Symmetry: D2
Subunit: 354 residues, 4 copies
Amino acid sequence: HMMKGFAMLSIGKVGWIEKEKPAPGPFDAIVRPLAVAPCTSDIHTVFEGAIGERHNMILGHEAVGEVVEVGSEVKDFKPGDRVVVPAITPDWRTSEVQRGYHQHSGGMLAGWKFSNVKDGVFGEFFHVNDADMNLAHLPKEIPLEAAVMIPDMMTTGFHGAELADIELGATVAVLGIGPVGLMAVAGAKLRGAGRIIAVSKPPVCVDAAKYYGATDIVNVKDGPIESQIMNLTEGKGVDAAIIAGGNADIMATAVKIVKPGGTIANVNYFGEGEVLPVPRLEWGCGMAHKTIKGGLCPGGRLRMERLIDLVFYKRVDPSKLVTHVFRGFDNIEKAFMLMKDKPKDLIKPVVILA
Amino acid sequence: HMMKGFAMLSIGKVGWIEKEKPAPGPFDAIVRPLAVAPCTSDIHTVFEGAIGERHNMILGHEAVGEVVEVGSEVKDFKPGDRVVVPAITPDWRTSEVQRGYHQHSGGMLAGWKFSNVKDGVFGEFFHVNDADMNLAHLPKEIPLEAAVMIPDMMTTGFHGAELADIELGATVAVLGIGPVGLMAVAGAKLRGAGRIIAVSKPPVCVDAAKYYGATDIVNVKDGPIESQIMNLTEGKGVDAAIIAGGNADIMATAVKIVKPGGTIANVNYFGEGEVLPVPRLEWGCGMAHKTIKGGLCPGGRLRMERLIDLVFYKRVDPSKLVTHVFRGFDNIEKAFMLMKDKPKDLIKPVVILA
Amino acid sequence: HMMKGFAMLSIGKVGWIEKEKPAPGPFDAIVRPLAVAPCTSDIHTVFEGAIGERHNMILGHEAVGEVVEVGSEVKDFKPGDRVVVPAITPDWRTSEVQRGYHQHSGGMLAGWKFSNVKDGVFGEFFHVNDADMNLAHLPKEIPLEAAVMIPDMMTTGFHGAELADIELGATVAVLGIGPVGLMAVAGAKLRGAGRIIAVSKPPVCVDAAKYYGATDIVNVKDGPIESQIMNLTEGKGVDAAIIAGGNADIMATAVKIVKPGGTIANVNYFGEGEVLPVPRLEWGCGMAHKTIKGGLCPGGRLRMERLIDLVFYKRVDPSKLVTHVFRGFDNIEKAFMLMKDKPKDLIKPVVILA
Amino acid sequence: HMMKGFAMLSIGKVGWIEKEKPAPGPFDAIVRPLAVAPCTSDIHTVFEGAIGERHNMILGHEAVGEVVEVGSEVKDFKPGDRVVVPAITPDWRTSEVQRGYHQHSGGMLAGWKFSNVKDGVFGEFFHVNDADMNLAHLPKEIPLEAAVMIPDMMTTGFHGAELADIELGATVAVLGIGPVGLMAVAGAKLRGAGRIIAVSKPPVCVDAAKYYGATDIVNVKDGPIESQIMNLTEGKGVDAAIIAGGNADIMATAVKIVKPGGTIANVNYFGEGEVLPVPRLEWGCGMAHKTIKGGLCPGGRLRMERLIDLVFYKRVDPSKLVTHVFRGFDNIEKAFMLMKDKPKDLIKPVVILA
Ligand SMILES: [Zn+2]
Ligand SMILES: [Zn+2]
Ligand SMILES: [Zn+2]
Ligand SMILES: [Zn+2]
């Protein structure tokens, strides 16, 4: 009745632990993973303690799997179903849900439970709260390596594009093309952007940017970002800027390149610094109408259902994000380490457990 | 001097007339057409008198052309510049512009001047009010047959999708696939729709729908729409429905297939009837939260610039709308009549003057 | 273990009956009523069968009360708590709630459960589903006759003003000034309306209208509404119109008085007709940008909490809506009858049980 | 036909100078001022060189006056008209106006022309560009000391409340109660806020705050702002926060007291510092969904007409902002200096010219 899981032992230390296999509440489900993917979040969780001290916590929160047990009141999911599990699995009966922000259901960022306040998906099984509200059915027609890009990568990048308030034909710059960065680009093509400028530090995975809708690549090795983008837009700037990675000073770049009345949409997790700087003069001394938004990705069944459809109806192919495919539980560790030691060919690895 | 122009002589009669070539005021410009396209709107105007009697009114309101004269205070356009002229050319200094509705600058629909309250583009020359605000430069790289779909077809169909409040992955139905309908399909793809259900009466121009993003074709000859669309969506309905053509009874269809909280976005010109019917029960007896919108397409310099970019950055290829291309002024009549009797191969015709 | 309740016996007949006292599930609460109100809704249900046949269904859905029993998992409400019970008490775990429409949680209007799919509040006890999500604590400082205006009247009227997209200083027309209409008048004042024109059939309850913020009274006995409003507004029309009562043709009137780009917000229950008429010409032949909205009122704890604060912080005093106050269970029968055959002094009656 | 005007001679020195009376262009008007008011902005321009060096620039930008000359094309305004002149008088024919941001018509803050790129209202005459778009008629029934609060104070404060996305019953904090702060309080009551917490530096002009709708006063002398507001709102924070004054660090306070999903609405001119700090942990490390907005107040004819109606229909009485009334041109110098330091509980002065 036991299970192995790849865990954070303490800040700096990871290892395999072994626990009682979890029991579902009346509304929850127990899922075994079919594919999983590690993210930079887990590294900052373990090695920089970006979310504080943790002890013997199974890592990972991007998984698609097979439901194996359901509580007595779970009505839409039965043992055997292939499901897509959003990284964010909020508690759906809170006053924040009545306000429309499920990401923060029960506290700030509290919709994010995996490898934060509960054991994550890097185990033989994991626990999904409120199955009927927090799982989506996975069509057979969608491959696992593509599906596992939906729980975080796709929903975050697309949320960047949602937050940017893009108008048809607007010119959009994307700052940082990690895997989320690339999805922000597809997210902008999905909101009808015209010109899409992808800005990356070397090494640039250019083909991926162009594939997902980029019209220009800006490489920081060719000069400051603000200068490159102003020159491309003949001084007008961009209608929106999506921040999908970088240091705190990238926020000032965003304000500096967005035209008045445009929007800076941040989806990046800033791990260091006490304040994120907003430049005074380039924010109009507070009046340039440059709206700044910054949000955690949506989770829950509906968001997953809606992005699955984007994948199924051939609107976006997230499989080009997957640069490494491993098989078998032992490789979960190997894949985890690839995210620390950042190589050159790497976007995102996927471990298929089958 | 004089000019040739194809006019509505009176309700029921069209023919070529002769006028003084119009002169520009200090802010206007005179354009001669390079390519023009006729629209059904002119048909409802001439043969159904949908806007009342007119006498010797040059018809047509879709053109790209060559500036030949400009007023003393026009700053961005010179004789010789190739320009895209939007169907809607409003007066930009009215209280309706400060309210955010330039389409109704000076009264309901008053932003639409060509072949409504001023002579249209089916002449050797025509008058564009407020040149710097109402003309867009045409890049050499964009062909004329494709560029002339921007003044009405592209801006209207897209406006249908803008009004529909489309969310990423939403399911969208498009009712009526004329040229405008087809652009509503492209617009829905541009707002990130997943499944897009295109509904037409036979003959369905299927290849065009599929090309611009349709995932399903509903043929009215196969049974009532509502029954077909419910069966496609396993009873759930659609998140939005864009009306781009049909009789008044199509407004009820839209309401019957949209789920509660969905949006019916109308861009169709209803030419006959006293009422457009809203079915009481399926509008929840006034409480289903099915919002209905109906709007004239945006025009002006910025709208055209933003859609030109959508063509330019390979977002939408509107050239597949153009099913008939003729050359020479004489053929304006031939093309105009093509819009009266609707044959089967016809989506949109274009007359090139060169 | 029985209880008396005032019920719809069958279509056409009401009477006091005796039922099993309800039991709460682990998430439910049992409330005894402290004050109740009858609604027109109950009339259309009983005598016109608006929601079909029913047998022994306790009527009524506006109550403030005292919790007497709670399920094992209720955390925020205990036996003894005075609470405001919203008319809409939805199931909070549905895909419609993730879409943002709890009113339609599980189907159209399904957030409306009382005297629809479950026994209403005209009993010695009634059952509130999901107490932690669907009850609000009632401060002692708020009188019961005012509090019982919050479950439907205040939230429906205010929803009318929320939907109208009222801008600061906008001119708002409210069509029909019953209790809901009067709260829409106050709703338009709370959203910053300047001029607020109240339109009523005789006898006009003017004093309440002016008291809730109306600046003009239009009496229909003095002539057609459309002609009256145009003369008041020097031909310009109104920025928004809230429909809070009338026949189906009041929709067509609303469209005729709203300026282009304005909004028609409906909160009225339309009981007869196959269609609600939208006039084609005055709706711009489908292009006047006159947006039409029609929605059921919000419910749940957060909606109630927020209106409770509006009364508590002296933003709105709903008591002037209450024209008849009785004491004792017996007078629920008398109050119900007042809703049919509506006399001249009557807005809304309240029965206090104490 | 010369005129004297109160000018910024250079950084640090002001004085009465002599200039040619300005002439109107064909669309412009010349106004003589009837009442005027100085603002802190002119101080930051004069003594801190906030907009760089200027020479012989007439100051001041809040005035209501009398039309004395009109251009050949002015159609809605004649010599003799009482007009309210908004601080922002933008050029209405730029692509930034088509995007919906007239404050930035022609560049960042470029809708603000008075005492920036043209002579301000502290002269015997001043020049209003594009009269038909930038003047509103002033009813006799509105007193001058009240009317002159509309060009800047009322429109700025209300814009703070417009930007905050306030929901009916929401809890709103206003940080800083200068004159703008007080209008922001009135703005939050006009968007239907329930609880309104006004936060000020000592000494608090309390009576004004309560008059415009404040329900709680927070004094910084009783402890840090963050600590107090958490205590008042039992840990939940406020749904929105309007910044109407303070140093750069007040932005961090704002982020710290607003709940996840709330909005920080800034209308303050931040004059010093290189960065405005957004605190990382309280901004969700980039994901708390705390939207930050910052905007220049709206201008133009319609904005003024709409605030005039709010005053006219007794929705807001701004005269309580007017604490000092002086008479005569000579007193323009005296009134200007009151704005350079903390004088009294009174603050904002008005000069009546009659
Ligand atoms: Zn992640
Ligand atoms: Zn047409
Ligand atoms: Zn009710
Ligand atoms: Zn000022």
